[PDB]
């Protein structure tokens, strides 16, 4: 989402209260999970109180409320919070890169680009060229005449 951007939009939340960040984080959008997982903060774990919502699944909750701009809380879909291991490129140890870039999608895009290039090459080479089955020798006196010219010019210059 907004991992690679550094924009500051404060007009999204007009009332910078405490509950605004939690309300913006609780809203599932688009295909986010509901309040049925275990260990996010305090509220709705189970018939139990792990924390609230950070079990296996899309953990879109308010684990670290940042009312100023937006709820900056990592997913951390596990039993322990405060861990730099999110689905998106977002680390906590001074900022680092992860394996979030999909290799399969990039490989498929490269294969598609290669197929398109092969098709373009076929179209360019079949409609412009043949795809189907369809005296300056120095052996004369110039072999010596050139040397004579060179000598004459070197003499004259």
């Amino acid at each position: 989402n907004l991992l690679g951007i550094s924009w500051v939009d404060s007009s999204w939340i007009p009332i910078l209260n405490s509950g605004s960040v939690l309300d913006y984080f609780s809203e599932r959008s688009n295909p986010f999970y509901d309040r049925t997982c275990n260990n996010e903060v305090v509220k709705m774990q189970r018939l139990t109180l792990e924390h609230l919502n950070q079990m296996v699944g899309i953990e879109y909750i308010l684990l670290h409320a940042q009312e100023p701009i937006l709820f900056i809380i990592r997913k951390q879909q596990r039993q322990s919070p405060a861990q730099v291991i999110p689905l998106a490129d977002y680390y906590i140890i001074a900022g680092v890169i992860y394996q979030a870039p999909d290799l399969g999608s990039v490989i498929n895009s490269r294969v598609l680009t290669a197929v398109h290039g092969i098709q373009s090459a076929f179209d360019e080479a079949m409609s412009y060229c043949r795809y189907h089955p369809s005296k300056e020798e120095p052996s004369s006196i110039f072999q010596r005449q050139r040397v004579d010219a060179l000598l004459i010019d070197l003499r004259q210059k």
């Binding site: 004369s140 006196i141 005449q145 010019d153």
Partner: protein, 37 residues
């Protein structure tokens, strides 16, 4: 004004195909023209 000088030459006088390259002679003619003595 601006007096001119000969840039390129051509020699026009055995076999049939005599010669077609004036490269060295043309370069020497250009050098003599640039000398402008």
């Amino acid at each position: 004004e601006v007096p001119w000088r000969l840039l390129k030459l051509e020699i026009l006088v055995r076999a049939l195909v005599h010669s077609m390259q004036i490269d060295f002679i043309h370069q020497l003619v250009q050098s003599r023209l640039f000398a402008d003595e």
